[PDB]
Structures are given as C-alpha cells and as structure tokens.
Design a binder for this molecule. Structure first.
Ligand SMILES: O=c1ccn([C@@H]2O[C@H](COP(=O)(O)OP(=O)(O)O)[C@@H](O)[C@H]2O)c(=O)[nH]1
Ligand SMILES: O=c1ccn([C@@H]2O[C@H](COP(=O)(O)OP(=O)(O)O)[C@@H](O)[C@H]2O)c(=O)[nH]1
Ligand SMILES: Nc1nc(=O)n([C@H]2C[C@H](O)[C@@H](CO)O2)cc1Br
Ligand SMILES: Nc1nc(=O)n([C@H]2C[C@H](O)[C@@H](CO)O2)cc1Br
Lengths: 236, 234
C-alpha cells in the first residue's frame, strides 16, 4: 500500500489523541485512526454494538481485572484490527503523500497492556499464552496490511500523565495510581527508548522510532513537534 | 476451489472420529481434518496441546469462568487446523474431498450457544464471541465454507455408553442431561433445520443424516455407500 503507517504510542493521557487531532488537519494527506477503547470510556452525556460491548467489558475490567483481562484484551485488539483495516480500505485514496497515523498499535495492546496484566497476575499462564498465540495468529493472517512504517513515541513522565488524567475528567481513570502509570512508563521506555524488548515481530527490530518529549503543554506550541514529525517522515 | 469440504457433525461419542478414520482409509482423494479439542483430551508439549489441555480442565472445573476463553481458543485452533489441511492436502487428487471433524458452526451454534443457555457465558461474552466469529468467517471463513454436512445421529443413551467405552477420565462425569441438551441442538440445526444462523449459505447446504446407534466399526458399507451417493449430488 502506498499509505505509510505510523503508530502514536504513549502512556495513558500522554496526549496522543490531542497530537493526532492536530496532525490530521495539517495536511489533506494526513489521516488518523483513533483508539477504539478511547471511545468505550466516556459517559452517556452514540448507539453501537461494539461500544456497548466495549462499555461493558471496560467497566468490568475496572471492577475485576483478574476475571476480565483476557476477554478485554482479546476484544480491544479485534476492535483495533477491524478499525485499522477500515481506515486503510476507506481513507486517503486521492492523497499524493498519504500518511496514516495509528492511535497505538497491535503491539501496545500486547507488549504494554497484556504483558503488564500477566505480570500483574490478572492473567494466568494459560490466558497469557493463549492470548499470545491468538495475537500471533490474528496479526499474521489479517494484520499484514498493517505492518508499521515507523513509530512516534510521545514521551511524558508518569507524573505528567497523572495530572493529565487529573485534567481529563474520566471517573474510572481518576483511580489509576501512579504506580500503575509508572509500570507502563518503564515498559514503553524498554520497548521504545532502549529498544531492548524483543518482540515476536521480526521487522519491528528495524522500524524507525521518533521520540518526542511532551511534558511541556503543546496545544499552543506544537510547531517544533510537527517539524520533527515532518523530518522523521521524509526519511521513510 | 476444487477441494470439496464436508463436515461431519454429531454429539460426544456418537462415532465421528471412528467414521472419519474409516472414511480416510477408503480413498486416495479423501482426506480428514480431526477436531482440535479431541486431541486436547489425551496425554498417552506443543503450545496448542498445552494451553488446550489446561483450558479444557479449567472448563470442566469451572464453566461459568472458562467458557468464553475455551470457545475462542477451540475455534481459533480449529480454523488454523482446517486452513493448513486445505493448502496442504489433496494437491494431485482428481475428485478431492476433505472431511472436517465438526466445524466452526457447531463451535458456535451447538457448544457456545449451549453454554450461553446454561448461564456459563454472560450476555456480553456471548455477544463478543459472536462478533469475533462473524468477523473472521466473513474475513476468512471463505475458503473453509462447506459443500455439505454429514450428521451422525446417535441417542444420548448411546453416547453415554460410548463415552464410558472410550474411558476418558474427564468425560466420565458428563451427565445424560448435558448430552440431551446437545442432542436437541443437533436435531434442531441439522435434521429439522429450524435453527437460525448468521451464515446465509448454510440454509441451502445439503445434509446427509446417518443413524449410528448400531455399531459400525465392522459393518459400515451401507454408511459409506450413502456418502458416495451424497458426494455425487453435490
Ligand atoms: O500537550 C498537551 C497534551 C494533552 N493535554 C490534555 O491532557 C489530557 C490527556 O490528553 P489526551 O486526551 O490526548 O490523552 P491520550 O490520548 O494520550 O490518552 C487531555 O485533557 C488533553 O486536553 C494538554 O492539555 N496538553
Ligand atoms: O460403531 C461404533 C462407533 C464408536 N464406538 C466407540 O465409542 C467410543 C466413541 O467413539 P468416537 O470417539 O469415535 O466418537 P466421537 O467423539 O469422535 O464422536 C469409542 O471408544 C469408539 O471406539 C463403537 O464402539 N462402535
Ligand atoms: N489494550 C489496552 N488494554 C488496556 O487495559 N487499556 C486500559 C488502560 C486505560 O485504563 C484504558 C485506556 O483508555 O484502558 C487500554 C488498552 Br488500548
Ligand atoms: N466447541 C466445543 N465446546 C465444548 O465445550 N466442547 C466440549 C464437549 C465435551 O464436553 C468436551 C470434550 O470435547 O469439550 C467441545 C467443543 Br468441539
């Protein structure tokens, strides 16, 4: 596909949806696929069978993670794979220099969230190794159109995020302690900064990573961030 | 797709594997795909084998907890078993037929549906499972789609005895009642054809019913004759 594919990765409330809502408008050639679990959260302040399903298991994961982590992760990834295909197959067709920016990836579902829940014992060996087998298979069967051209890592401190959950307003999330935000932080850092983490995805070894410090608020001062995105994107 | 795909359907211990192993022996153009979960029973470690054994045991031990997880893995493991057979087997055959031991419709419309009606999957699990199943078999289900179905009809009392003959520890506690629920879903789907389903083609798929209440391991010729006759109609 002539479409280049870049994932925007970062801790809970790093500012990914913000950044991507900024990039979409800066080129008719730039397009966005939001995270489907991003839409499962907010209140009944909308219809949808995926969202009712997502609404339900998300909330169920908050109340009993060790009962619902596998079902959640399973469905979150399905939902992401489906939605990524639809944008690939739907958007950017008349674009000269098309860039599709993914709000996270199949790989954050696995090596961030799913890996953490297992290590946090909310998944047993069986649940985790089934999910990993299911994830290898789901992604080597469909997800082949989705292999990433590069990755943008929005790096913020666990403490910035806490504040941005602070500043965001979602009830469920106000109860995420720093220690959990800290855990995902370390895992992003080992996956993306150090590039220690091996993945069962060979080409990942060689995908370009762009790391951007997002601690400073970028709503009214994003031009240098985008300048680095634009340069990153030319090497691709 | 010149390989004809036929599923063999029926209850636990009706005689599905026996009949499948009989069939395979009779022709060079005939190949079988044995059902995954059947292999997850025995010790007698592959990753699948390992997760599989574990999750069946957990399933037995607590079905309200483990049913969704079991049903996704079963079905996933079955799709990949059938996909591998189809791109592997019967390349030189002149009249190729691959017989599936069960299928993804029985995964969903007998077993998963039965667990839903048993309160072993709550509503969102059943809904999520249906969504995942629909998506894939509308993505991939393609080259797996069936040419016909062969239904091995046994009474629940026949299966109970056969379960006991087959001597799997696990299965010894399967009550007639559960067998009788499974029986009704088969009669329902495969004989009376009243069951409704998200795969429209299955409405016009031909079905051969075979009564396997009699032992056939040494007296199967009439069973096989009906199969050949069926195969020529498709
Ligand atoms: O530079 C920034 C980045 C984000 N935010 C705010 O921080 C919260 C979390 O951002 P976002 O919704 O983008 O979170 P993410 O998508 O990463 O989870 C939101 O209320 C944003 O308005 C902000 O004020 N300045
Ligand atoms: O005509 C038959 C068919 C089956 N069996 C036995 O009944 C048990 C159940 O058969 P099978 O495993 O093939 O049933 P499936 O579970 O595959 O439907 C096994 O011990 C078979 O050897 C039998 O005695 N006579
Ligand atoms: N694959 C995923 N697993 C999760 O547990 N979350 C959680 C973290 C956070 O509480 C919320 C994201 O809005 O869901 C998200 C994704 Br994406
Ligand atoms: N899709 C399935 N779901 C099940 O619960 N089983 C059960 C039937 C029996 O109780 C045990 C051994 O096959 O697993 C089988 C299949 Br196939």
């Amino acid at each position: 596909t002539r479409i280049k594919k870049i994932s925007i990765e970062g801790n809970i409330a790093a500012g990914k949806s913000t950044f991507v809502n900024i990039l979409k408008q800066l080129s008719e050639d730039w397009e966005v696929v939001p995270e489907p679990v991003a839409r499962w959260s907010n209140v009944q302040s909308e219809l949808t069978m995926e969202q009712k399903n997502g609404g339900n298991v998300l909330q169920m994961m908050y109340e009993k993670p060790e009962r619902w982590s596998f079902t959640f992760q399973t469905y979150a990834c399905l939902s992401r794979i489906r939605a990524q295909l639809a944008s690939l197959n739907g958007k950017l067709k008349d674009a000269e220099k098309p860039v599709l920016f993914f709000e996270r990836s199949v790989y954050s579902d696995r090596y961030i969230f799913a890996s953490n829940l297992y290590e946090s014992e909310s998944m047993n060996e069986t649940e985790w190794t089934i999910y990993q087998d299911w994830h290898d298979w789901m992604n080597n069967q469909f997800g082949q159109s989705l292999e990433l051209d590069g990755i943008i890592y929005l790096q913020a401190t666990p403490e910035t995020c806490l504040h941005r959950i602070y500043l965001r307003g979602r009830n469920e999330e106000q109860g995420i302690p720093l220690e959990y935000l800290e855990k995902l932080h370390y895992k992003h850092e080992s996956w993306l900064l150090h590039r220690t983490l091996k993945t069962n995805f060979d080409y990942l070894q060689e995908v370009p990573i762009l790391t951007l410090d997002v601690n400073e608020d970028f709503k009214d001062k994003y031009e240098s961030l985008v300048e680095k995105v634009k340069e990153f994107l030319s090497t691709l």
